Amino acid sequence: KTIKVFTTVDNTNLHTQLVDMSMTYGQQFGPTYLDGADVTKIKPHVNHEGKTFFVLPSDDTLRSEAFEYYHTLDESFLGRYMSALNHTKKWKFPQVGGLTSIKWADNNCYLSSVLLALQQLEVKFNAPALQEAYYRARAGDAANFCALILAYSNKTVGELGDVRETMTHLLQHANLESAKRVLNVVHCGQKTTTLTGVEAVMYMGTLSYDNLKTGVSIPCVCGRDATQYLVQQESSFVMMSAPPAEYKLQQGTFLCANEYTGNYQCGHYTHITAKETLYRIDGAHLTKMSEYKGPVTDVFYKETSYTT
Amino acid sequence: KTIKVFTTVDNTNLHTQLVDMSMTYGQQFGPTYLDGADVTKIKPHVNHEGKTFFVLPSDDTLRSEAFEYYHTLDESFLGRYMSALNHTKKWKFPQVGGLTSIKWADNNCYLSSVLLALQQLEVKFNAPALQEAYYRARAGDAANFCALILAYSNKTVGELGDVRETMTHLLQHANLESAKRVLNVVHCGQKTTTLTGVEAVMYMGTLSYDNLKTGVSIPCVCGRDATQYLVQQESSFVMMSAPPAEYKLQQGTFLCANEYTGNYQCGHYTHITAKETLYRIDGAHLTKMSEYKGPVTDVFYKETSYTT
Ligand SMILES: *[C@H](CC(=O)Nc1cccnc1)C(=O)NNC(=O)CCc1ccccc1C(=O)N[C@H](C)Cc1cccc2ccccc12
Ligand SMILES: *[C@H](CC(=O)Nc1cccnc1)C(=O)NNC(=O)CCc1ccccc1C(=O)N[C@H](C)Cc1cccc2ccccc12
């Protein structure tokens, strides 16, 4: 009933242990975490041999730093953070196109594009732990960042993610009230709305800021075809996201964008950024072009302020 | 290739005609309408024997009154209005509980409750044609009203309707800008919105004004559980509509309500109104109780104004 397993508590040294398939990991080790999860209540699985679990021998006052350093009220948070940081360190982050991409491993797509896109944005987080990493990530010590990206998103190493939904969780912890967007929709009746923070910088429906500024079609109204348009946006960038579609990107049209090529929950994120000429990144790789044409789910535009 | 069919152009006199199954109704009669529809492009169906079609021998300047009298830019509108008014007259509207219900015929449910509920509301339409009928409907000459209710909703005699979706089309033509509602939703980010007219008096989500005023749970936020609540409502009544659910009605709690007992698009609307004691109407019928307990999709509350 034994499987060989590596146990680190410091992520510096490792230890080799044996574990009973008959007992919960907690019974034998205490609180235990593997690849971003909380296996502390789980019996051992035979696929788990040859893996490195992060064990955290419990503590009642580590919550000093917890809500402080990490801005979370999850007892599990650090156990998930660290057991991912083990793996995350094993990835290779090379600086490419000036930014810092992630050699594909354990399904990095979303994390690459998320990280490829969070350099280029004017954003400062309200949890110190992110600040450090972001800047370790710009220089190249990004393993701390992807680990927190996982833990904030509640994701596991190797679990596919949607780039859009991931940032929702990172943007909850950043400079929010500083930002403002206003929109009005109109047939019979009419409706104007203002959103603060993350709400204000994220849109689901079109990839074109211009259309949002021009015209964009919305339901109920009374029947089915109102128009909604942007009235005011007070924020440093904008994210425009739609179900993946074919789209046109030109230099200076857009900050950056990322290209999803697959089915609903099975696809491939590829990040494009606009510099000298368009620069497309896929893991370590890169293609640079003066035209694009592909399938995009997300486009990025820098912006100062706009009033209608 | 002949079926016997009755042709009125004045809805006073009838004529008996024969029609070729080989030709479109227009080829033989001109523009032709049956039971609220525009059969003028359709070949005859053999079920159509023994029916009374409304024929409108075309006209280019009847649009004088059209957008005027009826507030529509449908050439078909009057042809649909009148061919329904034929049938609608054949129904029996008895005044019950003080209001005026509709003896069940051709699936009246929604029209009964809609009509049972549009007496009790403080609303004045912006098309004269409705004004007349509404008041013919309060006295009992309601056939003109249900006919327009059909034509405004684009429904046919005998086609089941959702009470909620029907009023959307009648409320497009009523006192709108006079009314105002404001709502704010809040996790990370926050969002406040104002709606004008019909938008402002109709809600989909709960049956309880009180909850809307108390608390009501809404998605995205960042994750999935914001709270939205009512800030200001400036209007004469309120409609609260939800997918049909079990609900509690007490006298003086609510203006009126209607009870849907069936599957999604196959069910039964039953209207309840609060007077001396609760008064439930089903076609001509009526039960009056001091308690209720049933399945409701729509509840009505009179209101003057409210500020948070
Ligand atoms: C990595 C994929 C990968 O590893 N590719 C390989 C590289 C090298 C070698 N082999 C393979 C990855 O992270 N993929 N992410 C992923 O699948 C996430 C999809 C997902 C997950 C959760 C929620 C939503 C989604 C999602 O649908 N995302 C796409 C971009 C949005 C989308 C797609 C299709 C239809 C649709 C409709 C409406 C809204 C979005 C939408
Ligand atoms: C009449 C039914 C009838 O004739 N009953 C009889 C009387 C005497 C003798 N025999 C029979 C009628 O008009 N029924 N209306 C109807 O079926 C309309 C349903 C409908 C139609 C179009 C769009 C929506 C709907 C609808 O679903 N309405 C219900 C009230 C809302 C509902 C119901 C179930 C689930 C659900 C979920 C979400 C939102 C609404 C919702």
UniProtKB/Swiss-Prot annotation, chains A, B:
Changing residue 21 to K: In strain: Isolate BJ02. A zinc finger (C4-type) spans 187-222. Zn(2+) 4 binds at residues 188, 220, 222. Residues 69-308 form the Peptidase C16 domain. The active site is at 109 (for pl-pro activity), 268 (for pl-pro activity), 282 (for pl-pro activity). It comes from the Viruses. Residues 1-55 form the Ubiquitin-like domain. It is found in: Host membrane; Host cytoplasm. It catalyses: Thiol-dependent hydrolysis of ester, thioester, amide, peptide and isopeptide bonds formed by the C-terminal Gly of ubiquitin (a 76-residue protein attached to proteins as an intracellular targeting signal). Responsible for the cleavages located at the N-terminus of the replicase polyprotein. In addition, PL-PRO possesses a deubiquitinating/deISGylating activity and processes both 'Lys-48'- and 'Lys-63'-linked polyubiquitin chains from cellular substrates. Plays a role in host membrane rearrangement that leads to creation of cytoplasmic double-membrane vesicles (DMV) necessary for viral replication. Nsp3, nsp4 and nsp6 together are sufficient to form DMV. The hydrophobic region HD1 probably mediates the membrane association of the replication complex. This is Papain-like protease nsp3. The lineage of its organism: Viruses, Riboviria, Orthornavirae, Pisuviricota, Pisoniviricetes. The chain holds residues 1543 to 1852 of 4382 of the full protein.
